[PDB]
Amino acid sequence: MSINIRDPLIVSRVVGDVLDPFNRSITLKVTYGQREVTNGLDLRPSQVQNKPRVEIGGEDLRNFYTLVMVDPDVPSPSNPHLREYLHWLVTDIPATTGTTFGNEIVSYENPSPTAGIHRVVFILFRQLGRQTVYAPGWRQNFNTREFAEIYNLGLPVAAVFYNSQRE
Ligand SMILES: [Mg+2]
């Protein structure tokens, strides 16, 4: 068939629940301690207690990127009425650098799921310009599609997710 049925972002419903279809075009590497996040990797809450290191690609150093980190499975995947929970929001990340050079306008909150296996999703967007993104007023019931529309973030240029569950 011509339709992709195997991409982990499709199989997990990250594309669907959270994201529209998009083309990966910028590298994104998220590392918790020594562990690089790969799609569907299981990480325990102790492993993600502190913010990860985030390195991004890009070829035009003039460009700025926003990183969104959300849990769509809140409070549980079977009753996700708080979808999405915003764990982290970092803006103005210069191309080819990472979140430490960006503005962490919603601080990292470490995941601590207490009901089921939760997807924890990192999404990178190219900004229209520096300083164009503002914070939401709340972390629960966040909506990445709506936020991206409001702040002219277009479609993702990269995304990856891990799975986490209570120990
Ligand atoms: Mg809700």
Side-chain angles (χ1 to χ4, degrees), residues 1-58 60-100 102-165 167:
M1 298 287 218
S2 68
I3 311 217
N4 185 305
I5 62 170
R6 278 162 262 287
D7 195 299
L9 297 185
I10 292 169
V11 176
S12 63
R13 297 208 207 255
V14 169
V15 171
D17 291 341
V18 181
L19 305 180
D20 285 328
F22 70 97
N23 172 47
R24 293 163 177 102
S25 64
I26 297 290
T27 60
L28 174 66
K29 287 238 164 250
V30 182
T31 306
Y32 278 105
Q34 290 185 251
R35 309 298 183 92
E36 266 189 18
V37 176
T38 59
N39 280 323
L41 178 71
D42 298 300
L43 293 168
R44 292 169 313 130
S46 60
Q47 304 182 272
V48 298
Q49 241 186 288
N50 298 118
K51 68 198 192 177
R53 300 194 293 302
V54 184
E55 305 190 334
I56 71 172
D60 202 303
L61 314 172
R62 285 150 30 215
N63 279 329
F64 292 96
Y65 295 80
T66 288
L67 185 71
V68 176
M69 179 194 170
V70 292
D71 180 349
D73 293 318
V74 285
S76 82
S78 65
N79 184 33
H81 66 270
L82 298 171
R83 169 173 302 173
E84 303 153 23
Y85 195 91
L86 181 66
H87 283 275
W88 201 23
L89 184 62
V90 189
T91 63
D92 297 333
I93 303 163
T96 73
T97 70
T99 51
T100 56
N103 291 336
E104 297 186 49
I105 64 172
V106 179
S107 75
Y108 183 85
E109 183 189 323
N110 54 304
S112 58
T114 60
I117 298 161
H118 297 207
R119 296 163 294 167
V120 181
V121 191
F122 298 90
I123 313 116
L124 192 71
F125 295 90
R126 176 175 306 112
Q127 291 169 203
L128 225 54
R130 202 199 66 125
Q131 288 292 269
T132 51
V133 185
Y134 293 66
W138 199 231
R139 289 183 190 255
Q140 320 217 99
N141 291 308
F142 181 78
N143 188 305
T144 295
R145 285 182 170 102
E146 290 189 352
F147 188 81
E149 174 66 27
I150 292 161
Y151 292 108
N152 299 320
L153 296 179
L155 285 177
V157 300
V160 67
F161 78 100
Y162 66 96
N163 294 308
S164 191
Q165 49 192 308
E167 284 166 68

